[PDB]
């Protein structure tokens, strides 16, 4: 087309979010719950040594 | 403006008809009632003839 803006409003409603930032999401609050009990444990056996 | 057709139909709202051609409306309607009654005349005077 040779519409002003079509490229890029088609490119948004075709990708609502792109598909390499939605995996590093993903991973990313997949790993979360595993630092967290790290952490946990970590302060835990600090706690224990006290 | 970058808008496709935006430059045709801004110029057609702007004249609604071109001068030049308006002028030449004008003229020929102003011309047809001497030219009607110079064939009329003349067909008159033809019947005169007669």
Same mark, same amino acid.
């Given at each position: %087309?040779?519409? /002003?803006?079509? &490229?890029? $409003?088609?490119?948004? #409603?075709?990708? /609502?979010?792109?598909? $390499?930032?939605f995996?590093?999401?993903?991973?990313?609050?997949?790993? $979360? /719950? %595993?630092?967290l009990y790290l952490?946990?444990?970590?302060?835990?056996?600090? #706690?224990? &040594? #006290?």
């Amino acid at each position: %087309t040779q519409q /002003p803006g079509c &490229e890029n $409003v088609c490119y948004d #409603k075709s990708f /609502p979010i792109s598909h $390499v930032r939605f995996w590093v999401l993903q991973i990313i609050f997949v790993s $979360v /719950p %595993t630092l967290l009990y790290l952490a946990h444990v970590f302060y835990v056996m600090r #706690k224990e &040594e #006290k």
